[PDB]
Amino acid sequence: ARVREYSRAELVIGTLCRVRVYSKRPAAEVHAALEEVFTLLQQQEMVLSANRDDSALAALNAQAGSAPVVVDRSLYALLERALFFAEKSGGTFNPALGAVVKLWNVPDPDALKEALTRCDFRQVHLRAGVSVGAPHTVQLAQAGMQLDLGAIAKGFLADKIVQLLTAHALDSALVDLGGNIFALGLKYGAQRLEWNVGIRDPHGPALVVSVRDCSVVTSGAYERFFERDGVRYHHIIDPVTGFPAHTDVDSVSIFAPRSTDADALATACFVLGYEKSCALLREFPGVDALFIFPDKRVRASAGIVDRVRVLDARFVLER
Ligand SMILES: Nc1nc(Cl)nc2c1ncn2[C@@H]1O[C@H](COP(=O)(O)OP(=O)(O)O)[C@@H](O)[C@H]1O
Ligand SMILES: [Mg+2]
């Protein structure tokens, strides 16, 4: 049985999604798995998207202030994890920030102060009965509050894809959802090697990190922004100010066995800045982190620093 390499990519969930697979299984089996990957992404766009009017999330937001809404167990589990990170991050990750995000999607100061009164994630009530077949429900108790899962959905979907690939007996893959990476297993050279994941120059890869069975997710200011009167406004909001976060790092990359967790923590850490991020990350010892600073210094945690290679010599890896 010969090793074959396959890839497939499509525009879906608002970005370019690519999956690369190495396998000795029959090609028809790999093709079927990749078909199901991209069917899954299409279906989940219709569940999770905060920027379509016809998604399940949009339907849920339309019921803010009203009765509990039945959701499927997958969406419930994502919300559960999002609220966990909201609590652990001290609200710097906030999945109930849609009222503010939608205004930035420069907004007026009062209009903005008003939106900030409708972002209390502690008013998202998840309830699920314990008896057989009991429904999962979500209630948004604060009128006008709006969920936005943009800071965790790609991580969640990368995890779901890894689960699907493994269900199809695939153990070597590179999942790339708009730069939200999961490195499954080892790649092939007959040698088996770690996947080499590049991290971009925030102002541009600058660095490459060798990983196995690991998600690599980066949050940064220069991923998405607009400019007005000489000021840049990026897409990661500080929930305290309602404005794009002022932070001492240009990007944070999180390395975690679950992409859901890497994505949420990457956003939280960006808002928190370097010193508070290191404190938070002590609570997640199975996670590693790499920080790129505006002066092009790079700091990486002990679990990954020996796997980091600088490709752009303007950057310096502190050891
Ligand atoms: N403090 C915050 N907490 C949370 Cl919970 N969500 C936030 C947030 N500020 C913005 N958002 C939303 O989340 C996306 C960024 O999510 P990201 O993973 O950091 O960046 P990428 O898009 O490159 O993956 C943005 O567009 C917004 O929709
Ligand atoms: Mg995120």
Ligand SMILES: [Mg+2]
């Ligand atoms: Mg993300």
